[PDB]
Amino acid sequence: IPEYVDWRQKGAVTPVKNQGSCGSCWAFSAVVTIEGIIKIRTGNLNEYSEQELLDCDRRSYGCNGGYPWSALQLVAQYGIHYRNTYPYEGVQRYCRSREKGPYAAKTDGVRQVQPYNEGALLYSIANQPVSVVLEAAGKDFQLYRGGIFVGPCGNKVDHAVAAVGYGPNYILIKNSWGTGWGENGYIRIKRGTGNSYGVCGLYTSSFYPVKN
Numbered sequence: 001i002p003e004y005v006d007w008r009q010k011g012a013v014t015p016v017k018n019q020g021s022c023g024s025c026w027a028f029s030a031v032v033t034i035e036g037i038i039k040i041r042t043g044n045l046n047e048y049s050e051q052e053l054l055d056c057d058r059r060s061y062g063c064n065g066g067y068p069w070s071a072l073q074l075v076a077q078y079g080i081h082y083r084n085t086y087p088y089e090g091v092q093r094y095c096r097s098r099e100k101g102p103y104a105a106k107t108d109g110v111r112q113v114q115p116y117n118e119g120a121l122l123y124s125i126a127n128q129p130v131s132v133v134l135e136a137a138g139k140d141f142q143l144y145r146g147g148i149f150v151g152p153c154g155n156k157v158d159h160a161v162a163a164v165g166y167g168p169n170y171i172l173i174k175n176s177w178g179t180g181w182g183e184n185g186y187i188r189i190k191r192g193t194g195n196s197y198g199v200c201g202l203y204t205s206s207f208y209p210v211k212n
């Protein structure tokens with residue numbers, strides 16, 4: 001795999017979103033990976049509905065948080081609608097998939113990246129955007145405005161984001177806190193520290209959709 005990967009330059013990443021006060025990071029994270037893999041397979045970059053996952057993933061807890069892997073299993077089992085069809089409202093409502101007509105996209109499964117393994121994660125990122133978790137509660141992460149982020153942070157992972165690239169010293173992360181946060185909505189987090197948890201626990205729990 002190459003020294004640099006940046007799915008934004010391959011046109012596989014949609015604009016940065018703001019999840020608002022809703023604890024819907026897990027859905028935003030999942031959708032980034034779906035938007036990425038659909039563009040990789042079909043050549044079309046579309047935006048898909050975080051709201052649908054919020055509303056429809058019964059294993060997750062709506063705005064109280066949830067699981068990227070569940071949301072990704074939902075899209076593999078059922079599918080997902082366009083974001084324009086099922087726009088984000090920032091509150092959990094009832095699952096409206098049936099009222100929104102046929103699904104716009106469907107994946108074929110979910111895979112987990114071997115945890116606590118930087119190389120495994122980089123390999124996955126080189127193939128497609130990956131859903132990753134990290135500890136975002138620390139003020140240093142919250143106040144990040146740019147640069148390669150090294151912490152401080154612990155491994156009390158609490159926030160799902162998407163890894164859309166990497167370089168020799170960092171993993172490139174699309175956050176869901178709007179374009180005002182970090183580097184136009186992105187964070188580069190240090191890699192290669194030999195910490196098997198990853199910086200801020202970044203290697204704890206990583207998943208990606210499979211699309212044939």
Ligand SMILES: *[C@@H](C(=O)OCC)[C@H](O)C(=O)N[C@@H](CC(C)C)C(=O)NCCC(C)C
Pocket residue numbers: 019022023024025026064065066067068133136137157158159160
């Ligand atoms: C993420 C978010 O929108 O805000 C981050 C502060 C959610 O809070 C979320 O879904 N968190 C998620 C942790 C990873 C992403 C799976 C979660 O389920 N946290 C609660 C875990 C606890 C019950 C042990």
